[PDB]
Design a protein around this nucleic acid. Structure first.
Ligand SMILES: [Mg+2]
Ligand SMILES: [Mg+2]
Ligand SMILES: [Mg+2]
Ligand SMILES: [Mg+2]
Ligand SMILES: [Mg+2]
Ligand SMILES: [Mg+2]
Ligand SMILES: [Mg+2]
Ligand SMILES: [Mg+2]
Ligand SMILES: [Mg+2]
Lengths: 215, 174, 122, 37
RNA sequence: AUAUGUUAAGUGGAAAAGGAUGUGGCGUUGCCCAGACAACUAG
RNA sequence: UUGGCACCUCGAUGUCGGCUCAUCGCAUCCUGGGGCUGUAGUCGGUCCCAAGGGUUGGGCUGUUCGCCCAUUAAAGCGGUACGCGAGCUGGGUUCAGAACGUCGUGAGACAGUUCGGUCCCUAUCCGUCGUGGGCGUAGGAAAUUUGAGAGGAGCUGUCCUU
RNA sequence: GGGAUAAGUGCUGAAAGCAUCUAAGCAUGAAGCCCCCCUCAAGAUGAGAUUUCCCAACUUCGGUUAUAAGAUCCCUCAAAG
């Protein structure tokens, strides 16, 4: 419900009530003007897609991607707002309301509405065995030349294969992950940020979509 | 079948209007129970609706009594109306009512509950003894089993919900 | 933390002076400990006299481990000595005169005969 | 319920019937319940 | 394909001692409209 | 498991335990559901259906096995070349040294002990874990996506109220 | 939180006038199976879906071309590696 699309900037602590300290991730949630929505009448899933931070004008000589293009020009002219950089589905909520071309708000929530968080990982390059998966290393002394490699992979020749799904050294990777049931300690309106509880994925100046919980 | 040439009756002001393969006994105590019983031929002329098919099949000689006995289960209850009782035993029980939803207090942490159905007149006419009422004998034998399944009879003292008259066993203890 | 085979200058007036922990009893595969748990432990040193004697497996509560404890406001209590109190298996000590200032956290776990029998409690 | 590879009437009040799977015997005392399982 | 039957388990399309109102064509015999074997009321 | 047979391997198919990493049966150890008890309750015996997940730290010996200490909801039984040395140690077993008991007149012997004893290799192809170029998808491109399918997760204690 | 079940418990019911959970129907019933939770996934060649942008001369379409939309080569780095 009301999937805002903020980005992080860091993490600090905020003293709650009587003595309680709770660590807080501060999520900068800039402008979010709703682009076209799609329903069951058109082709079959009721959803609201949302934009995020804008960029400059269109079609001069696009060296970068902070300039738009004739695809995203007419796709964003339809709602008569500036062209965008991050467009995300929300098939969670509310096919009825949310008129097209509406800024959403920042205060859809209250200080106590539980949320979820979807964001990409850090990604730590190509890393090996006992750092990626929870495997334990070998003995570092008494003569053993088996310090840190993964062990055996399969049996002898009554299974002449190695079974796929084997947890071998590959890339650590940034793939998506969703924590569940975080809460909001405080909402700001004027500086246009919110806060959450604990810590969410996705390193600084990243991207994170948040939405209501499913408890 | 030994209930083969043993047609039950058609004694009622009700009318067994056959159509397709079923009937609909539109009667005094209830309105038009209906079920397509089987694929067997029958007669319904004036006083005793009977049934017979081309005999000598041990899959159809047994299939007789599944058709005659159903047309005796239907017309008898819609004439009269019949269901059994449940006399709660021991102490602690106080089976009150909340309309069609009767609750029980058989010593648990919380009261049990139930949602009765149409054509089944739920009745509790005692301080702590209940008695169902309805039209369809198969349909009312369910709920009288479904309230036995709350606290079945504990075989030392005898506490627990029982039917009206039946020999529940008793084992002595210490 | 205090784990499998630590050695603890016990604080009671009941004859033991140093004990060592066999197991940190709790859940299955329990490894670590901190203030308020209960460990089973066998004495090594023994004061002449006292109550208990050397080589007697006794159960004993943990008090004031070396690493801190995070109470829920943001504070920390770091002591400077691992210590212990031998319990009677009714959550009360053996002797009377336990030394060595005690953390407040062992109160929800109904150890309150130790706290009233103690010096300065934080 | 007593699983056993042989069913016989343990006393002469115990009837011998057939059911959904097997050759259950049913009696009036709750120590005689067998099946050919 | 034709004609007679059989099985209702995937038996066919991998096991015996034993257990059993499964189901067919087969034979013998004792109970019988004077009326049993189902069920009611007498001690 | 202990064997029986000698069918493949002597132009070498590396052999016991342990660490690393698993994967599969159910004749089930805990947890879930019932019948039956010579089941007052709490506990307990015995049997049926059930593999989804769990299955501990130390002393002793090379150990397997085993006994013993303290716990835990439980410390299951097995297959996978008695799983796994082109992934690892080498403690024993099966190398030359030496000694003890003993048998042999002798050289020497022993499923009897006892101390010391070199563990080789840079990955072609399948199989894996990641990760890119070409082409297809009846015009070219960008953005957002539905989800046939496939993976992941599934465990429990103690206290208090009734 | 749902749907069908295994063990088991049931209601109605002849075969076999009584009983009888079953033969035809109707229940209920588990950390188990599927949908639900998260992750990947149209190379799913059965190649899906919505919105938005671009449309010409040689010339027997031999398309000769030479461009748009949109990319890229090449550079300064990094939230990536
Ligand atoms: Mg063999
Ligand atoms: Mg030969
Ligand atoms: Mg040769
Ligand atoms: Mg060779
Ligand atoms: Mg070799
Ligand atoms: Mg089993
Ligand atoms: Mg398992
Ligand atoms: Mg030692
Ligand atoms: Mg000699």
């Amino acid at each position: 419900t009301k999937g805002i699309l903020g980005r992080k900037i860091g993490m600090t602590q905020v003293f709650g009530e009587n003595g309680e300290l709770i660590p807080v991730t501060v999520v900068e949630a800039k402008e979010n003007v709703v682009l076209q929505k799609k329903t069951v009448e058109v082709d079959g899933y009721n959803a609201i897609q949302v934009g995020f931070e804008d960029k400059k004008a269109y079609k001069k000589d696009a060296k970068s991607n902070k300039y738009a293009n004739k695809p995203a020009e007419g796709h964003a002219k339809k709602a008569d707002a500036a062209p965008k950089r991050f467009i995300r589905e929300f098939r969670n909520v509310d096919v009825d309301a949310y008129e097209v071309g509406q800024e959403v708000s920042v205060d859809t929530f209250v200080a106590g509405d539980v949320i979820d968080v979807t964001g990409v990982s850090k990604g730590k390059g190509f890393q090996g065995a006992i750092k990626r998966h929870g495997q334990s290393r070998g003995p570092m002394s008494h003569g053993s030349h088996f310090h840190r490699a993964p062990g055996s992979v399969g049996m002898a020749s009554d299974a002449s294969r190695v079974f796929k799904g084997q947890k071998m050294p590959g890339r650590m990777g940034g793939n998506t992950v969703t924590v569940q049931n975080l809460e909001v300690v405080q909402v700001d309106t004027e500086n246009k940020v919110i806060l959450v509880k604990g810590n969410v994925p996705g390193p600084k100046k990243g991207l994170v979509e948040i939405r209501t919980s499913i408890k | 079948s030994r209930v083969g040439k043993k047609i039950i009756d058609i004694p009622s002001d009700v009318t067994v209007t056959f159509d397709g393969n079923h009937v609909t006994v539109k009667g005094p105590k209830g309105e038009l129970s209906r079920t397509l019983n089987e694929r067997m031929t029958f007669k319904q002329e004036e006083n005793t609706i009977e049934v017979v098919r081309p005999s000598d099949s041990k899959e159809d000689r047994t299939n007789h009594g599944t058709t005659r006995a159903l047309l005796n289960n239907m017309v008898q209850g819609v004439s009269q109306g019949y269901v059994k009782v449940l006399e709660l035993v021991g102490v602690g029980y106080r089976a009150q009512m909340q309309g069609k939803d009767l609750i029980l207090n058989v010593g648990y942490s919380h009261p049990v509950e139930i949602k009765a159905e149409e054509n089944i007149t739920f009745s509790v006419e005692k301080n702590t003894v209940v008695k169902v009422e309805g039209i369809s004998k198969e349909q009312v034998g369910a709920l009288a089993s479904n309230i036995r399944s709350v606290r079945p009879p504990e075989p030392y003292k005898g506490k627990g919900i029982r039917y009206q008259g039946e020999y529940v066993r008793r084992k002595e203890g210490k | 933390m205090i784990q499998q085979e630590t050695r603890l200058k016990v604080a009671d007036n009941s004859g033991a002076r140093e004990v060592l922990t066999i197991k940190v009893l709790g859940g299955s595969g329990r490894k670590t400990a901190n203030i308020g748990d209960v460990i089973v432990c066998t004495v090594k040193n023994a004061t002449p006299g006292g109550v208990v004697k050397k080589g007697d497996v006794v159960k004993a509560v943990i008090v004031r481990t070396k690493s801190g404890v995070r109470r829920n406001d943001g504070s920390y209590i770091k002591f400077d000595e691992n210590a212990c109190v031998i319990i009677r298996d009714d959550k009360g000590p053996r002797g009377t005169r336990i030394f060595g200032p005690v953390a407040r956290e062992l109160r929800e776990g109904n150890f309150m005969k130790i706290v009233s029998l103690a010096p300065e409690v934080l | 319920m007593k699983v056993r590879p042989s069913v016989k009437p343990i006393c002469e009040k115990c009837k011998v019937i057939k059911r959904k799977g097997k050759v259950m015997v049913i009696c009036e005392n709750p120590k005689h319940k067998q099946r050919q399982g």
